[PDB]
Nucleic acid binder design. Sequence first.
RNA 1: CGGCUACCCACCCGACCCGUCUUGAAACACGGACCAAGGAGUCUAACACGUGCGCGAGUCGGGGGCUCGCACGAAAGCCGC
RNA 2: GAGGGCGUGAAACCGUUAAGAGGUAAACGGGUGGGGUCCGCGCAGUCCGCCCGGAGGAUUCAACCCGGCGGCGGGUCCGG
Lengths: 187, 52, 147, 129, 52, 52, 127, 122
Amino acid sequence: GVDIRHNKDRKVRRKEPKSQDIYLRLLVKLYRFLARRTNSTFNQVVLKRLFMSRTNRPPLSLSRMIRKMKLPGRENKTAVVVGTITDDVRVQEVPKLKVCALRVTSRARSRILRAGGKILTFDQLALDSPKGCGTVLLSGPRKGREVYRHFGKAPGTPHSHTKPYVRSKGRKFERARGRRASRGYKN
Amino acid sequence: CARPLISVYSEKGESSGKNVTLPAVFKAPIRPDIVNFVHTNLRKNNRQPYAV
Amino acid sequence: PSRLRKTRKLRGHVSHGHGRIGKHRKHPGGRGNAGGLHHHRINFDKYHPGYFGKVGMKHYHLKRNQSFCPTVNLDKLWTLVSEQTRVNAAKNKTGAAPIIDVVRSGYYKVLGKGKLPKQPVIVKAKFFSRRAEEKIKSVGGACVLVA
Amino acid sequence: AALRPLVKPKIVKKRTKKFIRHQSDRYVKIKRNWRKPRGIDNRVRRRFKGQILMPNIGYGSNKKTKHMLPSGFRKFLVHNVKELEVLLMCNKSYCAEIAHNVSSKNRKAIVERAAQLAIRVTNPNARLR
Amino acid sequence: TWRRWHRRVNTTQKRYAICSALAASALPALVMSKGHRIEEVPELPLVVEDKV
Amino acid sequence: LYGTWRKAASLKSNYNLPMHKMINTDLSRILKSPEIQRALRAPRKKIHRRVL
Amino acid sequence: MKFNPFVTSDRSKNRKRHFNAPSHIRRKIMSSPLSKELRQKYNVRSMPIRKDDEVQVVRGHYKGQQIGKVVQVYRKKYVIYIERVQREKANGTTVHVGIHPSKVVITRLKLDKDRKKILERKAKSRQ
Amino acid sequence: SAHLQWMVVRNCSSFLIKRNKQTYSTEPNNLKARNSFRYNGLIHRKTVGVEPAADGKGVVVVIKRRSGQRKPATSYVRTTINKNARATLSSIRHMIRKNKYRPDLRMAAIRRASAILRSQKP
RNA sequence: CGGCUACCCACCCGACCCGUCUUGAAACACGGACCAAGGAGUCUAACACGUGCGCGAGUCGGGGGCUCGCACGAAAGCCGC
RNA sequence: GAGGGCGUGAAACCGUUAAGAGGUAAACGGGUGGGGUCCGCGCAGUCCGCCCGGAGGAUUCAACCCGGCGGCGGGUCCGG
Ligand SMILES: [Mg+2]
Ligand SMILES: [Mg+2]
Ligand SMILES: [Mg+2]
Ligand SMILES: [Mg+2]
Ligand SMILES: [Mg+2]
Ligand SMILES: [Mg+2]
Ligand SMILES: [Mg+2]
Ligand SMILES: [Mg+2]
Ligand SMILES: [Mg+2]
Ligand SMILES: [Mg+2]
Ligand SMILES: [Mg+2]
Ligand SMILES: [Mg+2]
Ligand SMILES: [Mg+2]
Ligand SMILES: [Mg+2]
Ligand SMILES: [Mg+2]
Ligand SMILES: [Mg+2]
Ligand SMILES: [Mg+2]
Ligand SMILES: [Mg+2]
Ligand SMILES: [Mg+2]
């Protein structure tokens, strides 16, 4: 024997993208070449986000993609998103900003072309910026998923605020013992 | 993504002067794995069950 | 797909993924929700609080039909009518305001949120909230009750 | 002296026994193919000395000398003239092997085309009149 | 007899597969790699007259 | 029956052409373009094998 | 391609009806083609064979230029027997060789008023 | 769209004999038997191949026209060369070198033409 | 002349009969005379999680309707006041 | 070598022939040795592909140009 330590062979990583999308594989090839040949950590992170799954790339929203450009210093920069930018029903005004994302929805593309912006894809973003200069890489609201609101140390023991599974949210379904002090214990 | 012109052929094989612009269905993207998925599910739709 | 099944991979192993010592035979713990109070209390408690007991009143012959009131927010209040309508109605013409009726859209109660611009409208609904009514008064619109 | 292929080294296999199954000698219901025993008391699984050896990853042959015939080629099976003529580019390392269900009338044409294209065939003088 | 035989597909994916198949029918390399004899055949997708 | 990317399908109700992921998808042209080869490190083709 | 849904493509059902068809169906099964001059003279493709038809055999062990008259038609065995076609047994007794009537070219038919009506219906339906 | 064509054709095609050994394309216009990307005669806009002549004497060369795509009746132009093996080897060398047309697979075309001129003479 | 090998024999060394209840099996623990065929984690409903695809504040025709009668058509295509 | 439960005809088991062996019940793993069947080849005699200096022979292009169609490349983006 040599290694007195435990044997953890592979750390965590996903090397090749599990998706069989040919377009995603071509983008993986192109951004892998740029990541290993341009010394660009932007291309490193975008290549890792292309290795990243469908679920861990949450859909970006149009109001958030406006507000992350409304901050000072983001006038002429391009909002690069590895993921989808969708419509928002809340917004009223759209600026003249540039979009570089995968699979922008139809109403979002329509409102951006009415507002006067320019949407791109990753090959056009690579032709315009090999190292990724003038870009801001954005990500979406992961923790607001319905799946993540069931996740915690417990459903209710220091009251725990983590949403136990039930059919119908209301009366007669999980509201009696441990949910109030009058009927048994209370958390 | 440009739309070229394809000639219309007669019953003898000679190219006629009638030229129709290529529609965008032939410029649409190609996803053979999605074709394989939908083809598999329609083949599952396309069968009598079997003996019980 | 039986070719992608774990059973096809586990051919050759004797106990087949369930151990030689424990011997999972038929139903070792019971059936279904068996032992909800006696011996599975650490799984019915600590994972489903509230499962045992009565909670309140008992409305005999209840319907999910009389309490039908789908709520609309002030964010959703604008897109019930098209954007062309509000632009061509508030393109610097006069003090006229378009009517946004939520009853035709299928919503009954207007609730209060943010993002309500300067251009006032007239909202007709069967119910309102005081916050949404104050937001409509602040942007200058008119409140109309219908039935 | 037939075709004399390229530089092929001393091909070793690191053992050449094609390991037998435990207690295949005692029972003739047991085929001689290997099958990993998963018993709780078996000496073969416990790897006692003097017993049989289990096939593991250590018996892997070299990648240079992998799938190598003793003549120096690598075999590739052939049914007809197109699958014979696909070996036109790599005939000095990859030899042909006519399928068993090929009749003699087409087999003589396949071996004649292999002799024209200088492709080694493993069975040149078989199933002939 | 109550095995889950028939599998519903989304109609957007059905139309997606139709568009992908019609787009892949236009490239000559794909159809020659499927195996149709397009040696002496004239220009891709062939359009014949209304007298046919 | 399907439409271009400008107009919708007139025969179908609510169908459009899908989103095209890579518009100008010539990967050889992209990797041999001067804008990409301007921003490359150096061709490092040395092997640096094991030294006894 | 079969389009009428009231007729089988089933192999078991077709073989069942074929090997259990009654004799008036087996007469239609045991039909034989005609020579080229006789089909030119009568304008008909094929006729069912009977006891007094002259037969030239085109295929089998006996082939060609052997125009003979048949003697028996076993519709149970789907076999006609020809007077010229012989085969000796072990004990020197001759016996007729089994010949299927689909491998049979009729050179001379039997003249009968019923067969004239059949031939007229064949010619009128062939048109 | 050549990379799309390669990512579709590199599996699930009516080629690519993956039968217990290495992969062969067999690819009726090709220069090497390996189903690779740099050696491919159906996908690229510029393709080179050499074939035996139908008369039994000489080598025919099939090169893609590149002036017209999706029109396979005129997409391949052919030539018939019957020389004393060195003049035609220099001819295919000048035809590939002195043009822009496929600076890759020079040695592929040269080795296949040389092997077929050896196999054709006795 | 050369040849490893599912051929046979001899010699040196090691080597108790497999499967599982067990802390412990070669056991004076149990099943197994031998051989050929069959033979054991499937399917439905529901839930949860992970992954892949489509659309995306929307999504879904599984319920019906429309096409000319079609072998594959018990499929597929479409509805949208 | 299809002879009336008759296509194909394995294993368990039995009979004969051929080879080998036999006091530590038979059988097995590692290592060799001996014998036998079989395989590839000629066993003091088996290597090829290129270039150049020598010896005879028959040919026609290539070196340069005229004649010819077909393909690559780019400028006036010339005519459209
Ligand atoms: Mg170690
Ligand atoms: Mg370990
Ligand atoms: Mg295990
Ligand atoms: Mg258990
Ligand atoms: Mg143990
Ligand atoms: Mg049947
Ligand atoms: Mg027990
Ligand atoms: Mg005990
Ligand atoms: Mg034991
Ligand atoms: Mg006992
Ligand atoms: Mg015992
Ligand atoms: Mg016993
Ligand atoms: Mg079995
Ligand atoms: Mg999921
Ligand atoms: Mg028999
Ligand atoms: Mg037999
Ligand atoms: Mg038979
Ligand atoms: Mg026997
Ligand atoms: Mg003896």
